[PDB]
Design an enzyme around this catalytic site. Structure first.
Site: not given
Ligand code: HEA
Ligand code: HEA
Ligand SMILES: [O-][O-]
Ligand SMILES: [Cu+2]
Ligand SMILES: CCCCCCCCCCCCCCCCCC(=O)OC[C@H](COP(=O)([O-])OCC(O)COP(=O)([O-])OC[C@@H](COC(=O)CCCCCCCCCCCCCCCCC)OC(=O)CCCCCCCCCCCCCCCCC)OC(=O)CCCCCCCCCCCCCCCCC
Ligand SMILES: CCCCCCCCCCCCCCCCCC(=O)OC[C@H](COP(=O)([O-])OCC(O)COP(=O)([O-])OC[C@@H](COC(=O)CCCCCCCCCCCCCCCCC)OC(=O)CCCCCCCCCCCCCCCCC)OC(=O)CCCCCCCCCCCCCCCCC
Ligand SMILES: CCCCCCCCCCCCCCCCCC(=O)OC[C@H](COP(=O)([O-])OCC(O)COP(=O)([O-])OC[C@@H](COC(=O)CCCCCCCCCCCCCCCCC)OC(=O)CCCCCCCCCCCCCCCCC)OC(=O)CCCCCCCCCCCCCCCCC
Ligand SMILES: CCCCCCCCCCCCCCCCCC(=O)OC[C@H](COP(=O)([O-])OCC(O)COP(=O)([O-])OC[C@@H](COC(=O)CCCCCCCCCCCCCCCCC)OC(=O)CCCCCCCCCCCCCCCCC)OC(=O)CCCCCCCCCCCCCCCCC
Ligand SMILES: CCCCCCCC/C=C\CCCCCCCC(=O)OC[C@H](COP(=O)(O)OCCN)OC(=O)CCCCCCC/C=C\CCCCCCCC
Ligand SMILES: CCCCCCCC/C=C\CCCCCCCC(=O)OC[C@H](COP(=O)(O)OCCN)OC(=O)CCCCCCC/C=C\CCCCCCCC
Ligand SMILES: [K+]
Ligand SMILES: [Zn+2]
Ligand SMILES: [Zn+2]
Ligand SMILES: [Zn+2]
Lengths: 196, 459, 65, 226, 107, 121, 180
Positions: B60, B90, B125, B152-153, B228, B230, B232, B243, B277-278, B303, B306, B428
């Site tokens: 998943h 193109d 994953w 590919s990426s 991380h 990734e 972003y 935008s 932070h992970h 962030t 924006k 988890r």
């Molecule tokens: C695209 C996906 C995405 C994005 C944008 C982010 C954004 C951020 N993530 Fe991430 N993060 C994940 C995807 C993402 N993350 C995933 C997938 C994991 C788990 C991976 C795994 O463990 O397997 C993860 C895990 C993860 C952890 C791990 C927690 C743990 O392992 O127990 C933490 C903690 O530091 C973290 C922090 C953040 C922070 C601080 C931001 C910042 O970018 C957020 C910034 C945005 C805001 C802050 C809000 C908008 C800003 C404002 C409204 C301004 C005013 C706000 C303030 C002044 C605070 N992320």
């Molecule tokens: C972007 C990536 C992505 C997306 C879309 C989702 C979508 C969803 N995920 Fe996600 N999920 C992950 C990334 C994602 N997840 C990752 C990275 C983990 C951690 C893996 C790990 O633990 O090792 C995770 C883990 C995770 C768990 C934890 C299982 C566990 O480890 O114990 C669960 C269930 O609770 C869950 C549920 C769901 C559900 C219910 C939806 C969605 O079904 C919710 C409903 C939304 C939709 C059905 C729309 C989705 C449609 C598309 C994605 C297609 C878009 C295409 C076009 C627009 C062209 N996810």
């Molecule tokens: O990963 O934030």
């Molecule tokens: Cu991170």
């Protein structure tokens, strides 16, 4: 000043009329340059030597006619007649008499517009200025209104946040009384279960 | 022809098509997870087949990240509009563009084939060793898929960077969004490849990096140094789309274009230096923890700029224009949803809060709100905006208020309860849990089945 | 030619054969099966049943069914 | 132009092996019926025949001299077309910057087709606005909705053809008196004698008029091995 | 920041006392899915699609100039759906400056 | 206050009512809304007001509902979402009677404060 | 009014599912025999021979379009001389009723309006400053708390007892000092 001074294209001459630089593998023939300088005379030395173009004297009357018809061209033609025109002098003559192509707007066909429409040009410009005046003023008006509104959001977010501050404040008071007065806190109570 | 085509716009369509196909497998896995978690007991997976659940969650995550959202937001919309936005005929590298999509498909086939043929086990994953290196051949197959995907990426990133050499107009914010993601890929991928090769060496070449006297924490550093960046690389293209949609639909010029651009650049630099932070709970040094916590909180500044610049784009727009278009609703919903995900990210950024919330479903809900809700909706909104240009039909989405409302409500029913169980606490990557966590798990499960049903109404 | 002006002209001009759409949906359906079929196969391999009965790994009342 | 790559050898001159072997018909073909290679060698043979006759140059008018060398006397019609051609070519790899367009003097947008995509950036300084893209179709005087900048499309079209240097030369240049082969022979004997060839093009050209292989050393010149 | 074009009061003075702001409708019209005729073949349906492009439409003002369909980005300038080859003639981004040279003028 | 203190070249309406008009409307029917506040068939143009006569920059405002139902319509003639009502009638009233506006706002805020504090506390 | 009734006649309901008869009743897969339609199938779609098997991009049916003079056919503008001036009449697109169907009447009025821009440079600059520095202040407000709590976890404490905990698959081993 390009490609290190090496011309992209240049002339090479060979003394032997049947010489081929690709078929033959002899080691005595020395190539010459466009002016005829043998290759064994380095460029730094040959470029200092002054080379001038010599046309057959039968051309002098023609070169004279050119100078008279175009007086600005006369000094260059005189140099050529007198055998004083180098390659640089020729280049100066060439680029001095090059002129740019001319475009005439009077020859462009125009998009069709009736005489009634042509008489309304001032009116349409007038409307455009009033639209720009109204646009610019509205920008100030809107900026004031909405940025002021954002303050309502700050105040609403400060009120809602303060609600959780009060809950947290009461929480800490309660916690301080747990270990001190709360009957829920029990000591000498939990006994080890032991291995099953 | 079909497979031989080099047209950049055709290839863009292929990327979206393949993302939806692979996405079906992704959603199915998600349904399996939520069904299992509906109560305590075994529901659809036997206790003797618990290894399958570990594989389900692993696949998943990997598929949704690398084979669905990344190919959709960085391969699909980019390959279709970027050369048009750049007023160029193109894409710079036609033949490379063709092979990139073919590579993605071939790596997908390898992964799914490994499900069918290999023993089904999982290691997350994040493929943490030593667990990843003591597994069966399915782990080897997954590694091949990731490495192939990496090829590919990177070549696609090279392709987009070359637009700077040929762009005949102005670099719009969206173009800046893709270029910076491309830079992030060029700098992060080579590190990932190295650590993946070391995983292979221990799996297949009798290497000893991840056995005693070798530090397993080493993998986590190199992995998350790509990990991380990734997240972003997956969000920045979404920001670029948001935008364009807001400016176009509201008929308002982007406000603070240069601040938008400089905010994207800033997020990238900062995102390249906050990976640990992970790794808060491993036991890093106090000063390291403080550095990473400090820099992680800084990312909110760019962030945040924006977000507020987007809000003023929607403010003041003409009332006469109909605001119920699905693309506009999704773009607005992104701001509302992304703030939730980001704020929770800042909460988990505090390491002491993180001790309680690491490896809990609070983290799940955090990155779902950003990806499963925010990124998905952004891709949908972008495709919807380009419906006329792309030309697809036979769907009822463009003006469907029921779909937007039902999706928003039900998606929140799934992940909002996952924040609660994070303080319950429910770890988890587990399938069985204590009976006192059923209520919230049940509510989220009801949300998952409902969202799937709403996906059928579009046709 | 006018027919070649638009990419995927038959589909855009609404003349394409429906089989192309059917194949796309079938391909997605097959992709989905890669998560369900191995689940059933693995369950039977290690248990002898394709799917469990809810809470059959725990103690059940006498009248439970 | 900056967008062009490096001059080829052909850009300077053509190899004498590309000279048409039927010179007699080449010098009698009308200009409209001569191809690129045929037109190159018609001008070179005729132009060098007059230039290598010094005694006649001073008495030859510039109108006649230009005709012999194949140079087109310029006039307002041809200048307009050539200028717009070179402006189109320049804009292929160069920016589009100029004065603000008004009704009296619209922004001129050259195009070959009936449409070209154009963007308005407004005026200078604070009067500059974000790019507003529009499709400039022929026959309409376009006005930017924001700054009121007037645009107009100019089409390089003439009689079912677009404008090219070849088209401009064919439409406006008029063939003069038919080239006389006696002049070719006379100049040939002037500069080519006793195994010395100081007009190589006229030695090859005279050989072809004679039938190919007639002049000394020409059979050996035409005998190749691959 | 951009705040519109600057206006001098002299340019806001009308030539008649009845001048008001022109009330021309900038709604292009009522549209829906492009509806192809069954009789038309693939070639003739392509012509139909090319004749339904909103970005080829404009509004003609009282003085005969037309304000075209405009967009912030060039994505809205290609035919919908996008053809295989779009920008054969390079789109021209017009920049404005105050520089001039004498050759362009005649006395 | 755009017409009042900022811009003097837009038509300025008269307030018919500082409260919205409730009307039942049918999908597929076009309605014409009075923008001057002088029509006697409020909220619609009566054929005798400024809007009907196209006088002084006043024109009828076209409106069409998507679905059948009861919709609120602007009486103050200045609501941002005109012809529909969004609360601008109350806002414009506060501008005209600022003392009354404070009373209502205090009362509304008082109720909101009590309820939110009572539930959270 | 109902605008659908205006163009109801043009829309004749269909007979075949997906708009094609069974291939047995008519073979739409074959190339059309009609003169000038050799590149099309019977149903009007492009034939595989034209697009795949003998695609011109692969060297089949080589036919250079450009002529000897480097020219291609170009259609001229509609020129109309008048009032001592040569004019070009632009091509106006057909009525949207012809292409879309609805009758172009009772169109709602959307006036011309120049772009909605935010004004007051000084005010805007201050807002943008706040858009950046209000978050910065909040971060700074968290910074000191973050340092303190981090220092608290990593505090040298006078511990008097040690419990060693080893994690194995799948159980937890505990080693504790035994009373003497
Ligand atoms: C695209 C996906 C995405 C994005 C944008 C982010 C954004 C951020 N993530 Fe991430 N993060 C994940 C995807 C993402 N993350 C995933 C997938 C994991 C788990 C991976 C795994 O463990 O397997 C993860 C895990 C993860 C952890 C791990 C927690 C743990 O392992 O127990 C933490 C903690 O530091 C973290 C922090 C953040 C922070 C601080 C931001 C910042 O970018 C957020 C910034 C945005 C805001 C802050 C809000 C908008 C800003 C404002 C409204 C301004 C005013 C706000 C303030 C002044 C605070 N992320
Ligand atoms: C972007 C990536 C992505 C997306 C879309 C989702 C979508 C969803 N995920 Fe996600 N999920 C992950 C990334 C994602 N997840 C990752 C990275 C983990 C951690 C893996 C790990 O633990 O090792 C995770 C883990 C995770 C768990 C934890 C299982 C566990 O480890 O114990 C669960 C269930 O609770 C869950 C549920 C769901 C559900 C219910 C939806 C969605 O079904 C919710 C409903 C939304 C939709 C059905 C729309 C989705 C449609 C598309 C994605 C297609 C878009 C295409 C076009 C627009 C062209 N996810
Ligand atoms: O990963 O934030
Ligand atoms: Cu991170
Ligand atoms: C003793 C031995 C000694 C040693 C010997 C050593 C020998 C060494 C040999 C070395 C070389 C070997 C290989 C040779 C390759 C040759 C390639 C070549 O030159 O071909 C020219 C050749 C040109 O053909 P042609 O002769 O001109 O005529 C072709 C036809 O006219 C047709 O014309 P067309 O090309 O226009 O039509 C193509 C198209 C026509 O389109 C359609 O069929 C309909 C439209 C699409 C429908 C929707 C599909 C789903 C959406 C996909 C979206 C993304 C698409 C991306 C682009 C396509 C990528 C494939 O359909 C297809 O064929 C494929 C469509 C996409 C299929 C995949 C979609 C996803 C499905 C997922 C399902 C599971 C989940 O290429 C092709 O057309 C065919 C190429 C086939 C390559 C197949 C590779 C498959 C790899 C799969 C994974 C492998 C591992 C696991 C396998 C497990 C199996 C059990
Ligand atoms: C240079 C140059 O000539 O560039 C144009 C030139 C193309 O010529 P052109 O025809 O003038 O281009 C037209 C413009 O593109 C069209 O541009 P325009 O006219 O619309 O706008 C004017 C200006 C518009 O652009 C600008 O003016 C932007 C200038 C600032 C860019 C951001 C700088 C970084 C942020 C600040 C850092 C501060 C650090 C402080 C440290 C303090 C320590 C004490 O144009 C350019 O600058 C175009 C070039 C932009 C190049 C961007 C390259 C990637 C930037 C990556 C930023 C950092 C990412 C960090 C990732 C994470 C790392 C851990 O660019 C190239 O030749 C492209 C080569 C690409 C190679 C990629 C592979 C490299 C390995
Ligand atoms: C997330 C989901 C929800 C999303 C919702 C939101 C969506 C928003 C909108 C998104 C829009 C994105 C952009 C769209 C752009 C569309 C452009 C377009 O149409 O391009 C034209 C393109 C092609 O049109 P064309 O130009 O006319 O092409 C002519 C051909 O090139 C030439 O024609 P031809 O007839 O000569 O074609 C050759 C044809 C020749 O075909 C035939 O002869 C077919 C004969 C009939 C076969 C039928 C299948 C039989 C299966 C039997 C199974 C038996 C099982 C038995 C089990 C027993 C158990 C006991 O095919 C082939 O020869 C090769 C076919 C290969 C592909 C199919 C592969 C199927 C799966 C295979 C799995 C294999 C697994 C092996 C495992 C082995 C392990 C050891 O269209 C398509 O390809 C169809 C696209 C349709 C969908 C478009 C999007 C619509 C909007 C979205 C709807 C929702 C979709 C949801 C996903 C699907 C859910 C399931
Ligand atoms: C006197 C009445 C007020 C009484 C209370 C006053 C308290 C003191 C406040 C400060 C002083 C106020 C002085 C105002 C005087 C008037 C000034 C003026 O210019 O008047 C004319 C001016 C309007 O005049 P106009 O512009 O000419 O046109 C008339 C129209 O009426 C145009 O009207 P408008 O556009 O201004 O309409 C107002 C509308 C404008 O705003 C909107 O309509 C925006 C609505 C956007 C909604 C987007 C969807 C959100 C869905 C999210 C779902 C998330 C689920 C998953 C969560 C997972 C979490 C883990 O406001 C709202 O709808 C309220 C939105 C408030 C924020 C919503 C979010 C609350 C979050 C709560 C915490 C959540 C925590 C968990 C989540 C994660 C946390 C990190 O009137 C106002 O300014 C009225 C403001 C009224 C504010 C009422 C706020 C009530 C709601 C409170 C929050 C909800 C919970 C409460 C418990
Ligand atoms: C983007 C390109 C620049 C990246 C620079 C990243 C540097 C971040 C600094 C983090 C830091 O303080 O490093 C500590 C941290 C380790 O901390 P502890 O395991 O607690 O050990 C400390 C004492 N035993 O250092 C690292 O892991 C550094 C990893 C190397 C990064 C190399 C990047 C190379 C880029 C090319
Ligand atoms: C019942 C489950 C859902 C089935 C479903 O919606 O399948 C749709 C899908 C596409 O059909 P249309 O959208 O009608 O495309 C043809 C041209 N209009 O249908 C099929 O693929 C038919 C076969 C489905 C097999 C599923 C196993
Ligand atoms: K369970
Ligand atoms: Zn302009
Ligand atoms: Zn009225
Ligand atoms: Zn009102």
């Amino acid at each position: 000043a390009y490609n290190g001074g090496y011309p992209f294209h240049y002339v090479v001459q060979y003394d032997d009329p049947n010489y081929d630089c690709e078929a033959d593998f002899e080691f005595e023939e020395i190539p010459r340059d466009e002016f005829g300088v043998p290759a064994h005379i380095p460029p730094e030395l040959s470029t200092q030597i002054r080379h001038t173009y010599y046309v057959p004297p039968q051309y002098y009357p023609f070169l004279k006619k050119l100078g008279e018809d175009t007086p600005e061209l006369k000094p260059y033609t005189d140099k050529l007649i007198m055998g004083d025109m180098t390659y640089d002098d020729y280049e100066e003559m060439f680029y001095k008499f090059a002129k740019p192509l001319k475009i005439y707007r009077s020859r462009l066909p125009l998009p069709y517009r009736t005489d009634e429409e042509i008489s309304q040009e001032k009116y349409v410009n007038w409307c455009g200025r009033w639209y720009s005046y109204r646009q610019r003023l509205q920008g100030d008006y809107y900026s004031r209104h909405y940025f002021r509104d954002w303050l309502i959001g700050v105040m609403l977010g400060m009120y809602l946040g303060n609600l959780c501050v009060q809950q947290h404040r009461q929480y800490r008071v309660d916690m301080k009384l747990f270990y001190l007065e709360a009957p829920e806190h029990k000591i000498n109570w939990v006994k080890p279960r032991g291995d099953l | 022809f079909y497979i031989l085509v080099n047209n950049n716009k055709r290839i863009g369509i292929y990327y979206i098509k393949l993302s939806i196909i692979i996405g079906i497998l992704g959603i199915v896995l998600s349904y399996i997870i939520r069904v299992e978690l509906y109560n305590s007991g075994n529901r659809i997976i036997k206790y003797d087949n618990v290894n399958y659940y570990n594989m389900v969650i692993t696949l998943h995550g990997l598929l949704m990240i690398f084979y669905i959202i990344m190919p959709g937001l960085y391969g699909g919309i980019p390959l279709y509009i970027l050369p048009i936005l750049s007023v160029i005929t193109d894409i710079v590298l036609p033949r490379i563009n063709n092979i990139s999509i073919i590579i993605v498909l071939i790596s997908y086939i390898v992964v799914i084939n490994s499900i069918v043929i290999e023993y089904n086990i999982g290691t997350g994953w994040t493929l943490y060793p030593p667990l990843s290196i003591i597994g069966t051949v399915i782990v080897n197959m997954i590694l091949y898929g990731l490495i192939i995907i990496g090829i590919s990426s990177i070549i696609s990133a090279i392709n987009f960077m070359n637009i700077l050499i040929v762009i005949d107009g102005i670099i719009y914010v969206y173009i800046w969004s893709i270029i910076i993601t491309s830079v992030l890929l060029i700098i992060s991928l080579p590190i990932l490849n190295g650590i993946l090769l070391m995983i292979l060496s221990d799996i297949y070449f009798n290497s000893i990096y991840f056995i005693l006297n070798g530090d397993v924490v080493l993998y986590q550093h190199l992995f998350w140094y790509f990990g991380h960046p990734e997240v972003y690389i997956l969000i920045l293209p979404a920001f670029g789309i948001i935008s364009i949609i807001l400016s176009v639909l509201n008929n308002k010029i982007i406000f603070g274009m240069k601040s938008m651009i400089l905010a994207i650049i800033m997020i990238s630099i900062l995102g390249s230096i906050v990976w640990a932070h992970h790794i808060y709970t491993v036991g890093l040094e106090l000063d390291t923890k403080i550095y990473f916590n400090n820099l992680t909180l800084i990312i909110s500044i760019p962030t945040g700029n924006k977000i507020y610049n987007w809000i003023i784009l929607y403010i003041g727009s003409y009332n006469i224009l109909y605001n119920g278009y699905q693309s506009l609703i999704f773009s607005i919903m992104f701001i509302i949803i992304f703030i939730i995900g980001g704020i929770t990210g800042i909460i988990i950024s505090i390491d002491i809060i993180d001790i309680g919330l690491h490896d809990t479903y609070y983290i799940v809900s955090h990155f779902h709100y950003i990806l499963s809700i925010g990124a998905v909706i952004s891709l949908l909104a972008g495709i919807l905006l380009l419906k006329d240009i792309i030309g697809y039909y036979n769907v009822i989405i463009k003006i469907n208020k029921y779909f937007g409302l039902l999706l928003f409500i039900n998606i929140n029913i799934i992940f909002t309860p996952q924040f609660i169980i994070g303080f319950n606490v429910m770890p988890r990557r587990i399938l069985e849990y204590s009976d006192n966590i059923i209520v919230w798990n049940l509510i989220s499960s009801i949300g998952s089945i409902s969202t799937i049903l709403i996906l059928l109404s579009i046709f | 030619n006018l027919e070649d002006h638009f990419d995927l002209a038959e589909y855009m001009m609404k003349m394409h054969n429906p089989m192309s759409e059917y194949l796309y949906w079938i391909a997605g359906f097959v992709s989905g099966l890669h998560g369900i079929l191995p689940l059933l196969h693995s369950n039977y391999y290690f248990s002898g049943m394709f799917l469990p009965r809810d809470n059959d790994n725990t103690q059940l009342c006498d009248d439970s069914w | 132009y900056r967008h062009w790559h490096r001059m080829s050898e052909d850009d300077w001159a053509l190899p004498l092996d590309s000279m048409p072997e039927d010179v007699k018909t080449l010098m009698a073909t009308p200009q409209t019926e001569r191809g690129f290679v045929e037109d190159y060698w018609y001008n070179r043979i005729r132009g060098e025949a007059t230039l290598l006759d010094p005694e006649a140059l001073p008495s030859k008018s510039y109108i006649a001299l230009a005709r012999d060398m194949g140079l087109q006397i310029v006039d307002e019609p041809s200048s307009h077309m050539m200028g717009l051609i070179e402006l189109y070519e320049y804009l292929r790899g160069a920016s589009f910057v100029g004065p603000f367009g008004t009704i009296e003097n619209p922004v001129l947008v050259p195009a070959v087709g009936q449409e070209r995509v154009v963007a308005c950036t407004g005026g200078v300084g604070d009067e500059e606005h974000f790019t507003l893209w529009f499709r400039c179709r022929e026959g309409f005087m376009y006005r930017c909705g924001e700054c009121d900048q007037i645009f107009m499309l100019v089409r390089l079209y003439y009689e079912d053809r677009y404008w090219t240097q070849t088209l401009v030369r064919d439409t406006f240049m008029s063939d003069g008196d038919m080239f006389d082969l006696k002049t070719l022979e006379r100049v040939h004997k002037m500069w080519n004698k006793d195994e010395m060839v100081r007009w190589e093009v006229g030695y090859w050209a005279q050989d072809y008029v004679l039938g190919k292989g007639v002049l000394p050393g020409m059979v050996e010149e035409h005998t190749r091995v691959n | 920041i951009y705040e519109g074009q600057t206006v001098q009061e002299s340019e806001l003075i009308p030539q008649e006392d009845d001048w008001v702001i022109e009330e021309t409708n900038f709604c292009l019209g009522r549209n829906c899915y492009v509806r192809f005729r069954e009789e038309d073949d693939l070639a003739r349906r392509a012509l139909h699609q090319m004749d339904s492009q909103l970005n080829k439409m404009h509004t003609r003002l009282r003085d005969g100039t037309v304000i075209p369909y405009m967009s912030f980005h060039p994505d809205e300038m290609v035919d919908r759906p996008a053809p295989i080859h779009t920008f054969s003639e390079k789109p021209l981004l017009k920049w404005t400056w105050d520089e001039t040279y004498e050759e362009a003028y005649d006395d | 206050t755009w017409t009042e203190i900022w811009w003097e070249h837009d038509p300025t309406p008269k307030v018919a009512q500082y409260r919205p008009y409730v009307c039942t409307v049918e999908s597929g029917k076009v309605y014409w809304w009075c923008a001057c506040g002088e029509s006697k068939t409020q909220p619609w143009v009566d054929g005798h007001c400024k809007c009907s006569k196209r006088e002084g920059g006043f024109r009828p405002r076209r409106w069409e509902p998507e679905h059948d139902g009861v919709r609120l319509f602007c009486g103050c003639k200045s609501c941002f979402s005109s012809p529909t009502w969004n609360g601008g009638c109350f806002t414009k009233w506060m501008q005209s009677n600022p003392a009354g506006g404070m009373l209502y706002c205090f009362a509304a805020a008082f109720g909101f404060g009590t309820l939110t504090v009572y539930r959270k506390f | 009014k109902s605008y659908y009734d205006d163009f109801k006649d043009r829309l004749k309901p269909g007979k075949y599912t997906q708009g094609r008869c069974p291939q047995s009743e008519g073979d739409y897969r074959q190339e059309s025999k009609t003169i000038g339609r050799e590149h099309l199938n019977d149903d009007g779609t492009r034939s595989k021979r034209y697009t795949v098997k003998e695609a011109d991009a692969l060297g089949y049916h080589y036919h250079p379009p450009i002529d000897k003079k480097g020219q291609v056919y170009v259609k001229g503008p509609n020129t109309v001389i008048e009032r001592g001036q040569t004019w070009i009449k632009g091509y106006e697109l057909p009525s949207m009723e012809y292409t879309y169907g609805p009758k172009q009447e009772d169109i709602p009025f959307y006036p011309r309006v120049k772009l909605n821009v935010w004004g007051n440079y000084n005010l805007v600059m201050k807002v943008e400053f706040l858009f950046f520095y209000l978050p910065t202040i909040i971060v700074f407000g968290i910074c000191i708390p973050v340092y303190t709590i981090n220092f608290a976890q990593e505090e040298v404490i006078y511990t008097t007892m040690t419990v060693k905990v080893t994690g194995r698959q799948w159980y937890w081993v505990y080693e504790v000092e035994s009373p003497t």
